[PDB]
Design an enzyme around this catalytic site. Structure first.
Site, PDB file in Angstrom:
ATOM      1  N   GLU A  42     -14.310  22.953   4.825  1.00 15.99           N
ATOM      2  CA  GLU A  42     -13.191  23.694   5.348  1.00 15.99           C
ATOM      3  C   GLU A  42     -13.086  25.060   4.704  1.00 15.99           C
ATOM      4  O   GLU A  42     -12.683  25.206   3.536  1.00 15.99           O
ATOM      5  CB  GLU A  42     -11.877  22.906   5.200  1.00 15.99           C
ATOM      6  N   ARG A  46      -7.915  32.387   4.287  1.00 13.58           N
ATOM      7  CA  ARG A  46      -7.094  33.015   3.262  1.00 13.58           C
ATOM      8  C   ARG A  46      -7.745  34.291   2.706  1.00 13.58           C
ATOM      9  O   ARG A  46      -7.140  35.010   1.918  1.00 13.58           O
ATOM     10  CB  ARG A  46      -6.878  32.038   2.125  1.00 13.58           C
ATOM     11  N   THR A  70      -6.207  26.786   6.930  1.00 12.36           N
ATOM     12  CA  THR A  70      -5.125  27.749   6.900  1.00 12.36           C
ATOM     13  C   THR A  70      -5.039  28.436   8.281  1.00 12.36           C
ATOM     14  O   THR A  70      -4.771  29.613   8.391  1.00 12.36           O
ATOM     15  CB  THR A  70      -5.261  28.791   5.779  1.00 12.36           C
ATOM     16  N   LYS A 136      -3.275  15.779   8.377  1.00  9.65           N
ATOM     17  CA  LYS A 136      -3.306  16.239   6.968  1.00  9.65           C
ATOM     18  C   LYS A 136      -1.960  15.891   6.354  1.00  9.65           C
ATOM     19  O   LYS A 136      -0.964  15.986   7.000  1.00  9.65           O
ATOM     20  CB  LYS A 136      -3.651  17.750   6.867  1.00  9.65           C
TER      21      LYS A 136
END
Lengths: 216, 216, 216
Positions: A42, A46, A70, A136
């Site tokens: 992943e 960011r 994100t 998640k």
């Protein structure tokens, strides 16, 4: 079995949550991770290099299953798909993300896995009813951790979770041992220092120390 | 810089969460707070004297920045504006509050600061997408505290928080030291006994003991 | 006073959260619970025998107030009403549940009590504004427990809670002593072993040990 289940049956249950400043580190990082048996990557959006890093890994490291994290907006969602993300992780879920995900599944072009964050029983139920049963839990450790997940297993026994947030070398196995936990996100495999210094042997070491699910 | 940033650059980082029974205590209380260098005053609508107290402070203590807290509905929101609130704090956020806030910003008459509560990553993302990037974390101490805020800084690095709920003399500096925390709500400066007894010297003492942000 | 208040004024403040595999255990279980002074029975829809168990208890044990729990969807909500549920508990709340509950209250045929889960100040405010002021806090123990409930009492002083999730023989009285807590859900009265073995004396013992609210 979901697409996510099928990937997880063929790699280690630990998803590196990657914060990558420099595009040039993407391929060697990913190669170091797969060399240690860790394939579900992943790459968070960011940093500015995030998207490009996905595309680079996608092309050059076909054995990695490379995703985006994100992802907060529909536009983030679309850009991940254009970068070549095979899966998309978001820290929470909004009506705009639900709508976007439905729409790309309806169009049928992106057949990847959407893995969104939830933090309350009501958030779970909203995600499940949009059709998403693998979620998640974010940020798992600060919001009640193993106890929270276990409490949720009672009313939601068909929902599976990936806890992320304060998962560590010392507690990941405890999370994974929960019957409703299928994998976990962790940061320690791809720490900033390791990437900036190009310490690919140490990355591979950290990946190789992760245990398979059947070995907890 | 926001309006809130500009106020905070000119006062102490601690917002008294005020529960006031008697209108007559409002002015001396506020005068006692500013005398100790504490200017951002959140008068909650938890008593009948709340609104009137705002208006009284607004008129008589022009150096205080006086706001309303425990704004739960659009009607609470409008009444705060009519009372002269310069800012509005709510413990959570609903579609009705989002709508109200948009609408008063669209009309352009109230140019104050709306500071709403969030408690999950999904709540943050909903508030941020309505256009609000400075949020209350409520009730911060019971829902994961500094650890929660720090975990949220990763995916939300442009969101700033004001934690409220179980902030104390003994832990406020730790909250304030977080890079995504700009201020905190606290109750101890305006405790009930102090107000009922008119102990303005003690109120001023408690305010004067609060440190500026640069001095933590 | 609500309907729930009126029931609680006439029974013990502890709602068994029932997981029942075999229909045949329903009546003796319920008879064992009322014999110990415990009348508000939440039969969760976590097993196939759940609905049938409600109907059986409703018919055969008129002194029990029998409800459904783990109601997650509008269809779950309707089936509970058809089974004869006097109250409905859900672990969280969604727009679809809000809508369903409004609609059955509008039709006027089911006049029972809807008791939905909340876990954040924003969830409380959404439930309260739909018109529901008595809420489940779920899962109370993992998400901040007594401290969370107490923090919520400040801005929400007219909301009452039933905490469920990690309530035990050893901590239920502490929850009940909170001024905004009216009752609690617990699992220990109807543990699986007790039901499978038909140990009705032990069920009755566990119920009889629960104290009335005025006796904490």
């Amino acid at each position: 079995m979901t697409q996510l289940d099928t990937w997880l049956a063929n790699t280690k249950p630990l998803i590196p949550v990657i914060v990558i400043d420099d595009l040039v580190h993407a391929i060697p990082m990913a190669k170091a991770l797969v060399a240690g048996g860790v394939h579900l990557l992943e790459v968070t959006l960011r940093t500015e290099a995030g998207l490009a890093a996905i595309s680079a890994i996608k092309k050059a490291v076909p054995e990695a299953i490379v995703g985006a994290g994100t992802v907060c907006t529909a536009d983030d969602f679309q850009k991940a798909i254009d970068a070549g993300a095979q899966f998309i992780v978001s820290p929470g879920l909004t009506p705009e993300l639900i709508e976007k995900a439905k729409q790309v599944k309806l169009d049928g072009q992106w057949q990847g896995v959407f893995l969104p964050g939830v933090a309350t029983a009501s958030e779970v139920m909203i995600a499940a009813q949009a059709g998403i049963t693998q979620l998640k839990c974010f940020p798992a450790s600060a919001i009640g951790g193993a106890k929270l997940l276990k409490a949720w297993s009672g009313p939601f026994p068909d929902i599976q979770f990936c806890p992320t947030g304060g998962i560590s070398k010392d507690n990941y196995k405890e999370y994974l041992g929960l019957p409703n936990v299928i994998c976990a996100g962790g940061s320690w495999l791809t720490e900033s220092k390791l990437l900036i210094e190009g310490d690919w042997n140490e990355v591979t070491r950290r990946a190789s120390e992760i245990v398979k699910l059947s070995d907890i």
